[PDB]
């Protein structure tokens, strides 16, 4: 269906400890494929997926040069934002940035992205029309006027309309076996007697990709979404994800509760009960 | 590929 | 907006020169370039807000610095023959990859072995021919600068005390008199086309001004001949 | 690793013809591509700035392209006027070292848009020195002790100057390679 | 300066079976800033050579990390994950549950 490529950036200042720490990652859907850490013995854009090692040395030389330029620019922005907000130079501040593009099944662009944040709150972002900005405060409007005079959005619209969607299609083709093939979840239900008259039914969903999944319990036809303990989708570690939902069921009525799982890899939603 | 842009704030 | 100082520099081998540059008021980054014939425009060093940002293959004997007033200086020490090139200065608003740089007029540096062969030009205006005024109803005046070295000359015409540019042709590059000698003298010609009635009127005054750039004060001079200092040799004519 | 190259070195074209100036650059993290014109006296003046991801930029009679995959650039000049005669430099801002960007220029292509000679009126005149030279003019741009200057149409007609400090030198016969009596 | 407390989840990569190698994960998310201390515990004492995932954040600019290590679960051994953040008054420990 719809696919996306994302690039995350994080810069945390280390006053007196040296250079600020810079960590950036790249994602195609929910799959990490590139990485660059400033605290590396030899910092270079490192691969994290098997279908990206196929690129030549000139590819990794550009991505490393670009990541190092983003690090040195973020290092200057950390000093600049101290003047915008009149903050002390002895405090640690965080600078975050994320840009990317979304494509649908037709291979065309759906939406471009470019957002920035300072100390966890929004700072300045590129609007959906790829031609205007949205500043969060008066200090962010200073950056807005400088980026509009330098025509920064003119390069962003060319990248998001062109280089972002074109390189995403070649990544989806080179990784067609992992990015375009969805892994259905492995489902099962466990029983845990909390007391002699009460029990808990837990519906499991393990080893699925992507992370988008919906676990909903139903008691003989009606959902108990309010009192269903659901945990956030967690990564298993091998590019797969896990999720479970639990309900406090009175003892003896276990066969009146059904679990419904929805995932893109399933042709139709599954229905599972305890099965003792 | 990444974005080739250098834009300080 | 970008200004450089000085404009021309003629010096000897082993000397030291200082190149000043004043960027635009809104520009915080300064760039230094060197344009030689064998390598073209080559990047030297870049300064941003007083600190060094980027650095090319600049030699150790080339020193630069950006001052808190954002103006830059470039000291070229132990000059050699190969250092004779054009030195440009550029400035940009900041470090934006979507913005452009703005170059200045450029400083031309010429380094010689000895200043003995430096000569000022000899100028002479030539009045038009009567066969031309009856055949083309226009009059052309020729200005010839002869016997100068090096080619740091700026020719300009002045009619009635004001510089003009229409009907003016100036040779793009000076020609050598004797192409066999190592440091040959240079020559430069120029033309001024005016109406045949304009030249026939004896009340109009034509003047060919040649701004020659020679030795600065820093260079010594022990020869009996006059110092080949940056001077102007002119020649005038009336209708 | 970075070395921009422009071909050809020189180019002389009659007025009115469309032009194409090629430019090739090496594989690097280019940030933009510019085309500068260099005039005598005046410094460099920007003409077109192509962004990193852009493939075309236009402004009047100038249309430049950019292809990072092949690493080539092309500047298209339409309706070549005599004012367009200058040296055209191909500049790119590539990522150098570690985190720095450096604007690298090409060798340049000098251009001479030859204007139409309205009336080929070849004539050689002998001018007289003031307070005390041979002029070959209006020759259409076709085909030791005496110094001859090159023709001057762009800084309008043709003009060639020949002089000599010789008592045998005759203004009528410069060399074999309208003469008024 | 906004500060959020992290959500902690301790789990295994595969279904726990005594005597079979597995991976003990401690997924923390929803915190800010990124400076956080995560240690995997075995019977109360820290496990060495614990690898972590690369720093990334969500739509709300909240970071998330995954600390994982190889281990072999047994019936008697008890595992936990201790997390210390600026938003916490004391380090919080979450014991590993076989069915969660
Ligand atoms: C310049 O490029 C064009 C194509 O854009 C090509 O047809 C032409 O032959 C090239 N000229 C040279 C001298 O390489």
Strand partners, C51: C48
CB of A83 closer than 8 Å to CB of A76: no
Integer Cα distance of A100 and A95 in angstroms: 17
Cβ-count burial A188-198 (b if 16+ within 10 Å, e if not): bbeeeeeeeee
How far does residue D21's CA lie from ligand 1's centre (Å)? 8
Integer Cα distance of E42 and E70 in angstroms: 12
Read off the DSSP letter of residue D83: G
Nearest one of D158, D154, D173 to D122, comparing CA atoms: D158
Radius of gyration from C-alpha coordinates of chain A: 23
- Residue D57 belongs to what domain range? 5-114
How far does residue D57's CA lie from ligand 1's centre (Å)? 19
Integer Cα distance of A221 and C18 in angstroms: 88
Strands D19-24 and D100-105, bridge-based pairing = unpaired
How far does residue D7's CA lie from ligand 1's centre (Å)? 9
Selecting from C124, C136, C172 the residue whose C-beta is nearest the C-beta of D129 gives C124
Strand partners, A247: A201
Selecting from A35, A119, A231 the residue whose C-beta is nearest the C-beta of E9 gives A231
Residue E61, phi-psi category: left (phi > 0), alpha (psi -120 to 50), beta (remainder)? left
How far does residue D23's CA lie from ligand 1's centre (Å)? 9
Strands C186-195 and D44-51, bridge-based pairing = unpaired
The total of other beta-carbon atoms located within 10 Å of residue A64's CB is 21
A138-149 and A57-84 helices, crossing angle to 10°: 130
The two tokens of residue A124 are 């300045």
How far does residue C103's CA lie from ligand 1's centre (Å)? 29
Integer Cα distance of E66 and C194 in angstroms: 85
The two tokens of residue A273 are 């009960």
Q: Using CB atoms, which chains have 3+ pairs under 8 A with B? A: A, C, D
Output the CA–CA distances (angstroms, integers) from residue E61 to A101, A191, A275, D153, in the order listed.
18, 37, 42, 65
Contact A69 D53 (CB under 8 A): no
CA angle D141, D146, D147 (to 5 degrees): 55
Residue whose pair of structure tokens reads 């600068």 in the numeric block:
C145
Nearest one of D115, D89, D118 to D104, comparing CA atoms: D89
How far does residue D22's CA lie from ligand 1's centre (Å)? 6
Integer Cα distance of A125 and A108 in angstroms: 22
Contact D53 A155 (CB under 8 A): yes
CB of C106 closer than 8 Å to CB of D43: yes
Integer Cα distance of A218 and C192 in angstroms: 99
> Based on the number of CB atoms within 10 Å of its own CB, is C217 exposed (0-12), middle (13-18) or buried (19 or more)?
exposed
Contacts of D133 (CB under 8 A, 6+ apart): C126, C142, C144, D126, D127, D161, D162, D163
Contact C97 A155 (CB under 8 A): yes
Strands A214-219 and C122-127, bridge-based pairing = unpaired
Output the CA–CA distances (angstroms, integers) from residue A260 to A219, A245, C94, in the order listed.
11, 10, 57
CB of A193 closer than 8 Å to CB of A251: yes
The answer, for D69 touching chain A at a CB cutoff of 8 Å, is: no
The DSSP line for C99-141 is: S--EE---EEEEEES-GGG-B--EEEEEEPPHHHHTTSSEEEE
φ/ψ (deg, to 5) at D40? -65, 130
The answer, for C54 touching chain B at a CB cutoff of 8 Å, is: no
Selecting from D28, D53, D99 the residue whose C-beta is nearest the C-beta of A158 gives D53
Same domain, C65 and C124: no
**DSSP SS3 for A78:** helix
Same domain, C109 and C121: no
The two tokens of residue E90 are 């004391």
CB of E7 closer than 8 Å to CB of E28: yes
The two tokens of residue E51 are 């690898």
Nearest one of A147, A125, A114, A129 to A8, comparing CA atoms: A114
Q: Which of D12, D28, D43 to mutate to test binding with chain C, by most C CBs within 10 Å of its CB?
A: D43
Integer Cα distance of D74 and D20 in angstroms: 6
Output the CA–CA distances (angstroms, integers) from residue D112 to D59, D82, D159, in the order listed.
21, 7, 16
Output the CA–CA distances (angstroms, integers) from residue C109 to C36, C59, C87, C151, C215, in the order listed.
10, 17, 7, 11, 12
Counting every residue written for chain A, the total comes to: 276
Contact A163 D54 (CB under 8 A): no
Integer Cα distance of D9 and D75 in angstroms: 15
The two tokens of residue E29 are 């998310």
Same domain, C220 and C135: yes
Method of determination?
Answer: X-ray
Which chain A residue has the Cα nearest residue E7?
Answer: A232
The two tokens of residue A41 are 């013995």
The two tokens of residue C81 are 């023959």
Same domain, C71 and C128: no
Counting every residue written for chain E, the total comes to: 100
The answer, for B7 touching chain D at a CB cutoff of 8 Å, is: no
Q: Verify cis geometry, omega within 30 degrees of 0, for the bond prior to E33.
A: yes
How far does residue C99's CA lie from ligand 1's centre (Å)? 29
| Calculated CA dihedral for residues D71, D72, D73, D76, nearest 10 degrees | -160
Nearest one of C107, C121, C83, C123 to C20, comparing CA atoms: C107
Q: Which residues in chain A touch residue B8, judged by CB atoms under 8 angstroms apart? A: 73, 76-77, 80, 146
In angstroms, what separates the C-alpha of D44 from chain B's closest C-alpha? 23
The total of other beta-carbon atoms located within 10 Å of residue C21's CB is 25
Cβ-count burial E68-85 (b if 16+ within 10 Å, e if not): bbebebeeeeebbbbbbb
The two tokens of residue A156 are 């962003």
φ/ψ (deg, to 5) at D105? -105, 160
CB of D135 closer than 8 Å to CB of D161: yes
The total of other beta-carbon atoms located within 10 Å of residue A80's CB is 14
CB of E87 closer than 8 Å to CB of E5: yes
Tell me the HSE value of C105 on the side-chain side, using a 13 A CA sphere: 14
Q: Which residues in chain E touch residue A238, judged by CB atoms under 8 angstroms apart? A: 13
- Residue C126 belongs to what domain range? 114-239
CB of C47 closer than 8 Å to CB of C112: no
Contacts of A60 (CB under 8 A, 6+ apart): A44, A45
The answer, for C94 touching chain B at a CB cutoff of 8 Å, is: yes
Strand partners, E58: none
The two tokens of residue C10 are 């003629």
Q: Which residues in chain B touch residue C98, judged by CB atoms under 8 angstroms apart? A: 5, 7
The two tokens of residue E37 are 């201390």
Kindly report each contact of residues C53-60 with a partner whose C-beta sits within 8 Å and lies 24 or more positions away, as own/partner.
C53/C29, C53/C95, C53/D100, C54/D96, C54/D97, C54/D100, C54/D101, C54/D102, C55/D97, C55/D100, C56/D96, C56/D102
Q: Which residues in chain A touch residue E3, judged by CB atoms under 8 angstroms apart? A: 120
Q: Kindly state the greatest CA–CA separation across chain A.
A: 72
The two tokens of residue A31 are 């799959």
- Residue E49 belongs to what domain range? 1-100
Integer Cα distance of C133 and D127 in angstroms: 12
Strand partners, C232: C211
The two tokens of residue C96 are 């934006």
Contact A62 D28 (CB under 8 A): yes
Same domain, C130 and C206: yes
In angstroms, what separates the C-alpha of A139 from chain B's closest C-alpha? 10
To one decimal, the resolution in angstroms is 2.4
The two tokens of residue D34 are 């510019």
Nearest one of D136, D138, D77 to D112, comparing CA atoms: D77
Nearest one of E100, E10, E12 to A229, comparing CA atoms: E100
The H or E element that residue A33 is part of is strand A31-37
The DSSP line for E9-49 is: EEEESS---TTS-EEEEEEEEEEBSS--EEEEEETTEEPSS
The two counts, helices (H) then strands (E), for chain A are 5, 17
The H or E element that residue A261 is part of is strand A257-262
Q: Where are the alpha helices (DSSP H) in chain A?
A: 57-84, 138-149, 152-158, 164-174, 176-179
Same domain, C119 and C53: no
Q: Which atom of ligand 1 is nearest to the CA of D22?
A: 1
- Site residues for ligand 1, CB cut-off 6 Å: D 7-8, 20, 22, 74
The H or E element that residue A25 is part of is strand A21-28
CB of C16 closer than 8 Å to CB of C77: yes
**DSSP SS3 for D108:** coil
Query: Can you list the domains of chain A with their CATH numbers?
Result: 3-180 (3.30.500.10), 186-272 (2.60.40.10)
In angstroms, what separates the C-alpha of A60 from chain E's closest C-alpha? 19
The two tokens of residue C66 are 């950006």
In angstroms, what separates the C-alpha of A242 from chain E's closest C-alpha? 9
Contacts of A120 (CB under 8 A, 6+ apart): A94, A96, E1, E2, E3, E4, E32, E33, E61, E62
Integer Cα distance of C95 and D55 in angstroms: 22
Integer Cα distance of E13 and A202 in angstroms: 17
D11, D22, D66: residue to mutate for ligand 1 pocket, most atoms within 8 A of CB: D22
Nearest one of A184, A190, A187, A186 to A275, comparing CA atoms: A190
Contact D29 B6 (CB under 8 A): no
The number of distinct structural domains making up chain E is 1
The answer, for C169 touching chain B at a CB cutoff of 8 Å, is: no
Integer Cα distance of E65 and E80 in angstroms: 16
Integer Cα distance of A245 and A226 in angstroms: 12
Q: Which residues in chain A touch residue C95, judged by CB atoms under 8 angstroms apart? A: 73, 76
Output the CA–CA distances (angstroms, integers) from residue A251 to A207, A257, C161, in the order listed.
30, 12, 113
Query: Using H for helix, E for strand and C for coil, what is the string for A146-185?
Result: HHHHCCHHHHHHHHHHHHHHHHHHHHHHHCHHHHCCCECC
Chains D and B touch each other (3 or more Cβ pairs < 8 A): yes
The total of other beta-carbon atoms located within 10 Å of residue A275's CB is 9
CB of B4 closer than 8 Å to CB of D52: yes
Selecting from A73, A76, A150 the residue whose C-beta is nearest the C-beta of C99 gives A150
Which chain B residue has the Cα nearest residue A60?
Answer: B1
The total of other beta-carbon atoms located within 10 Å of residue A31's CB is 18
Q: Which residues in chain D touch residue B5, judged by CB atoms under 8 angstroms apart? A: 31, 52
**DSSP SS3 for D62:** strand
D5, D6, D10, D20: residue to mutate for ligand 1 pocket, most atoms within 8 A of CB: D20
Strands D109-114 and D10-14, bridge-based pairing = parallel
Q: Which of D54, D93, D100 to mutate to test binding with chain A, by most A CBs within 10 Å of its CB?
A: D54
Contacts of C117 (CB under 8 A, 6+ apart): C149, C183
In angstroms, what separates the C-alpha of D51 from chain B's closest C-alpha? 9
Residue whose pair of structure tokens reads 């001479």 in the numeric block:
D112
**CATH number, domain with residue D22:** 2.60.40.10
Same domain, C59 and C122: no
Integer Cα distance of C62 and A44 in angstroms: 32
Chains B and E touch each other (3 or more Cβ pairs < 8 A): no
Chains B and C touch each other (3 or more Cβ pairs < 8 A): yes
Read off the DSSP letter of residue D3: -
CB of A259 closer than 8 Å to CB of A245: yes
Same domain, C144 and C206: yes
CA angle E61, E63, E68 (to 5 degrees): 160
Residue whose pair of structure tokens reads 């300066």 in the numeric block:
E1
Read off the DSSP letter of residue A138: H
The number of distinct structural domains making up chain C is 2
The DSSP line for chain C is: --EEE-SEEEEETT-EEEEEEE--TT--EEEEEEEETTTEEEEEEEEETTEEEEE-S--TTEEEEE-TTS-EEEEEES--GGG-SEEEEEEESSS-TTS--EE---EEEEEES-GGG-B--EEEEEEPPHHHHTTSSEEEEEEEEEEEBSS-EEEEEEETTEEE-TTEEE-SSPEESSTTSTT--EEEEEEEEEEHHHHH-TT-EEEEEEEE--B-TTS---SSSPP-BSEEEEEEEE-
How far does residue A159's CA lie from ligand 1's centre (Å)? 27
Strands C8-12 and C107-112, bridge-based pairing = parallel
Same domain, C27 and C135: no
Same domain, C97 and C127: no
Q: Verify cis geometry, omega within 30 degrees of 0, for the bond prior to E55.
A: no
């Amino acid at each position: 269906g719809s696919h996306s490529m994302r690039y995350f950036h994080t810069s945390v200042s280390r006053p007196g400890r040296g250079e600020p720490r810079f960590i950036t990652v790249g994602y195609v859907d929910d799959t990490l494929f590139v990485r660059f850490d400033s605290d590396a013995a030899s910092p270079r854009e490192e691969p994290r997926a098997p279908w990206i090692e196929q690129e030549g040395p000139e590819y990794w030389d550009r991505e490393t040069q670009i990541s190092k330029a983003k690090a040195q620019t973020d290092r200057e922005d950390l000093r600049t934002l101290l003047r915008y907000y009149n903050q002390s130079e002895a405090g640690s501040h965080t600078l975050q940035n994320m840009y990317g593009c979304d494509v649908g099944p037709d291979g065309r662009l759906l939406r471009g992205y470019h957002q920035d944040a300072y100390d966890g709150k929004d700072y300045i972002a590129l609007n959906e029309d790829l031609s205007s900005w949205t500043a969060a405060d008066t200090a962010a409007q200073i950056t807005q006027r400088k980026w509009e005079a330098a025509r920064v959005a003119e390069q962003l619209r060319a990248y998001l309309e062109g280089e972002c969607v074109e390189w995403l299609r070649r990544y989806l083709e080179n990784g067609k076996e992992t990015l375009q093939r969805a892994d259905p979840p492995k489902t099962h239900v466990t029983h845990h007697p909390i007391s002699d008259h009460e029990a808990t039914l837990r519906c499991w969903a393990l080893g699925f990709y992507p992370a988008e999944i919906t676990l909903t319990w139903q008691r003989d036809g009606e959902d108990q979404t309010q009192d269903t303990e659901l945990v956030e989708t967690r990564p298993a570690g091998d590019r797969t994800f896990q999720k479970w939902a639990a309900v406090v069921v009175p003892s003896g009525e276990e066969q009146r509760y059904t679990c419904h799982v929805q995932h893109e890899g399933l042709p139709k939603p599954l229905t599972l009960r305890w099965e003792p | 590929t990444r974005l080739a842009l250098i834009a300080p704030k | 907006g970008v200004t450089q100082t000085p404009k021309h520099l003629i010096t000897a081998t082993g000397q030291r020169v200082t190149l000043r540059c004043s960027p635009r008021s809104g520009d915080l980054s300064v760039y230094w370039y060197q344009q030689s014939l064998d390598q073209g425009l080559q990047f030297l060093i870049q300064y941003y807000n007083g600190e060094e940002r980027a650095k090319g293959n600049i030699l150790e004997r080339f020193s630069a610095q950006q001052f808190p007033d954002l103006h830059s200086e470039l000291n070229l020490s132990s000059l050699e023959l190969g250092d004779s090139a054009l030195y440009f200065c550029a400035s940009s608003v900041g470090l934006y990859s979507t913005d452009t740089q703005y170059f200045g007029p450029g400083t031309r540096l010429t380094v010689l072995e000895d200043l003995k062969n430096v000569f000022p030009p000899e100028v002479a205006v030539f009045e038009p021919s009567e066969a031309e005024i009856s055949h083309t109803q226009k009059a052309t005046l020729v200005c010839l600068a002869t016997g100068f070295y090096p080619d740091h000359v700026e020719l300009s015409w002045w009619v009635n005390g004001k510089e003009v540019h229409s009907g003016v042709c100036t040779d793009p590059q000076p020609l050598k008199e004797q192409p066999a000698l190592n440091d040959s003298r240079y020559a430069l010609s120029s033309r001024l086309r005016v109406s045949a009635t304009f030249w026939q009127n004896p009340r109009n005054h034509f003047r060919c001004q040649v701004q020659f750039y020679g030795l600065s004060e820093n260079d010594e001079w022990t020869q009996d001949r006059a110092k080949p200092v940056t001077q102007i040799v002119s020649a005038e004519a009336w209708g | 690793k970075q070395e921009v190259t422009q071909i050809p070195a020189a180019l002389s074209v009659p007025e009115g013809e469309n032009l194409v100036l090629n430019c090739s650059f090496t594989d690097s993290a280019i940030y933009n591509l510019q085309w500068f014109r260099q005039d005598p006296g005046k410094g460099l003046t920007s003409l077109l700035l192509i962004q990193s991801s852009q493939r075309e930029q236009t402004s009047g009679r100038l249309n430049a392209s950019l292809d990072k995959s092949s690493g080539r650039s092309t500047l298209y000049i339409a309706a070549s006027q005599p004012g367009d005669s200058a040296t055209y430099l191909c500049a790119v801002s590539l990522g150098t070292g570690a985190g720095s960007y450096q604007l690298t220029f090409g060798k340049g292509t000098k251009l001479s848009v030859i204007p139409y000679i309205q009336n080929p009126d070849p004539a050689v005149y002998q001018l007289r020195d003031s307070k005390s030279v041979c002029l070959f003019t209006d020759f259409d741009s076709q085909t030791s002790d005496v110094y001859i200057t090159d023709k001057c149409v762009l800084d309008k007609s043709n003009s060639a100057v020949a002089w000599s400090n010789k008592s045998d030198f005759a203004c009528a016969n410069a060399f074999n390679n309208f003469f008024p009596s | 300066m906004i500060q959020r407390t992290p959500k902690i989840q301790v789990y295994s990569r595969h279904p726990a079976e005594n005597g079979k190698s597995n991976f003990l994960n401690c997924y923390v998310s929803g915190f800010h800033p990124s400076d956080i201390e995560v240690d995997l515990l075995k019977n109360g004492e820290r496990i060495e050579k614990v690898e972590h995932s690369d720093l990334s954040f969500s739509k709300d600019w909240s970071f998330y990390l995954l600390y994982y290590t190889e281990f072999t679960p047994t019936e008697k051994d008890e595992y936990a994950c201790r997390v210390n953040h600026v938003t916490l008054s004391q380090p919080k420990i979450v014991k590993w549950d076989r069915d969660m």
